[PDB]
Amino acid sequence: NLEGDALHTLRVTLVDPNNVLQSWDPTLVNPCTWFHVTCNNENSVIRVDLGNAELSGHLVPELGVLKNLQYLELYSNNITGPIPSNLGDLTNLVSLDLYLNSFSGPIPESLGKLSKLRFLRLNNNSLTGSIPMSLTQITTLQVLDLSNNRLSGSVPDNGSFSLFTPISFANNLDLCGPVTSHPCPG
């Protein structure tokens, strides 16, 4: 059970004072009966729903083996560290909700590979660096929130970013461009 091993590895590295993940018993045939985990009819994980679960610690790159994952709902916790650089491995993701956490480092360029993504909500973290241009390749994007981070540099208004307005980018370190409220000096 590769998927269960990956999720158990996540449990080890997350900090879970309330033992929300107590049921995450890797001796089971699969993780489909675990609390907060949902599988499809083929017993493959499609949702991890851990919003507002009083978790901290960091994520793990083993998340990338959850090939059928559609929802990664980890918002409103105190998770730290970087967004794993390989989250773009999760090509069936339709929602990536990491908002209201303590993530730092850059937005991974690999997120541009998430060609089915509808929700990308990373607001209210401590993310730094520039927004990857690869994100404009995500033609399905409908809800984007990168506000309240420490992002800097130019933001394009092309591809799917043409859909969004300054509220999606507000209160960063030094963003500029047509979709933001400040033109780029160059």
Ligand X SMILES: *[C@@H]1O[C@H](CO[C@@H]2O[C@@H](C)[C@@H](O)[C@@H](O)[C@@H]2O)[C@@H](O[C@@H]2O[C@H](CO)[C@@H](O[C@@H]3O[C@H](CO)[C@@H](O)[C@H](O)[C@@H]3O)[C@H](O)[C@H]2NC(C)=O)[C@H](O)[C@H]1NC(C)=O
Task: Show binding-site residues for brassinolide.
Answer: 35-36
Could you tell me which of 61, 50, 54, 59 has the C-alpha nearest to residue 16? 54
**Nearest residue (beta carbon) to ligand NAG:** 159
Question: Rounded to the nearest whole angstrom, what is the least distance from the CB of residue 137 to ligand X in the complex?
Answer: 32
The option from ligand X, ligand NAG, none interacting with 76 (CB < 5 to 8 A, set by class) reads ligand X
47, 68 contact by CB (below 8 A): no
Q: Which is nearer to ligand NAG, 70 or 123 (CB)?
A: 123
Question: Rounded to the nearest whole angstrom, what is the least distance from the CB of residue 135 to ligand NAG in the complex?
Answer: 9
Cα–Cα distance measured from residue 176 to residue 159, given in angstroms and rounded to the nearest whole number: 17
**Annotated binding-site members:** 35-36
List residues binding ligand X (CB under 6 A): 52-54, 76-78, 102
Which residue of 57, 105, 153, 156 would you call a contact of ligand NAG, by CB under 6 A? 156
Which residue of 38, 130, 152, 171 would you call a contact of ligand NAG, by CB under 6 A? 171
Amino acid at 34: W
Could you tell me which of 125, 79, 78, 90 has the C-alpha nearest to residue 106? 125
The overall longest dimension of the chain from CA atoms, in Å, is: 58
